[PDB]
């Protein structure tokens, strides 16, 4: 057996390689790479032994069953979809949240999570938005960017970290800010916040809330 090799054929466009069939044949050296032509588990017992069936026949059959589906392709699960991100959303960009309790607030974009949702921080002290996920389809990416290239985002701030935790109701159950989350908030805020204060009036900008007014039309203005 042999270690796998990086595809010798660089991608020209999607679905077309750089090199023709015979160019690849020489690259792969195929001229010299020629080639020519349990269901039962035995056990003891106090008869002596019993041959046991691993999987048993069903004890019940419904009166009717649905047939099998025809076979398709390209219908991947969600976890295997490719994630896209608007070119205008680069780390440090100031976004405008359009939905939720935080609608209208101006936040700082950190990174895109593996599920494709955006990770943002208020920061909490400027507008009371914690490390929070948000959909890129529901944010207006402004042209205001801060340089957070030197910001270390904890590796454990992943999708499962932000996934809501079920609460049972038999009265009501309330959400409790875990102590870990507070420690996490400071780790990222304590870096981004001084970077905000390097830009004059940026902190005041992130305190204010976006709104439309008389004579202001989105198609006319630049964010």
């Amino acid at each position: 057996k042999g270690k796998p090799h990086c595809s010798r054929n660089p991608v020209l466009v999607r679905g077309i390689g750089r090199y023709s069939r015979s160019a690849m044949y020489s690259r792969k050296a195929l001229y010299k790479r020629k080639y020519a032509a349990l269901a039962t588990v035995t056990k003891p017992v106090g008869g002596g032994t019993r041959v046991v069936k691993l999987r048993k026949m069903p004890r019940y059959y419904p009166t009717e069953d649905v047939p099998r589906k025809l076979l398709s392709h390209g219908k991947k699960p969600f976890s295997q979809h490719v994630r896209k991100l608007r070119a205008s959303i680069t780390p440090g960009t100031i976004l405008i949240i359009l939905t939720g309790r935080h609608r209208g607030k101006r936040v700082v974009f950190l990174k895109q999570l593996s599920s494709g949702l955006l990770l943002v921080t208020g920061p909490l002290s400027l507008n009371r938005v914690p490390l929070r996920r948000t959909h890129q389809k529901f944010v207006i990416a402004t042209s205001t960017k801060i340089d957070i290239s030197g910001v270390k985002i904890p590796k454990h701030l992943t999708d499962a970290y932000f996934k809501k935790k079920k609460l049972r109701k038999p009265e009501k159950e309330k959400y409790e800010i875990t102590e870990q989350r507070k420690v996490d908030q400071k780790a990222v805020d304590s870096q981004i916040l001084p970077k905000i204060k390097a830009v004059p009036q940026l902190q005041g900008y992130l305190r204010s809330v976006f709104a439309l007014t008389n004579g202001v039309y989105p198609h006319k203005l630049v964010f």
Binding site: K34, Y35, A36, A37
Partner: peptide, 4 residues
């Protein structure tokens, strides 16, 4: 045959 030759291909093999």
């Amino acid at each position: 045959r030759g291909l093999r």
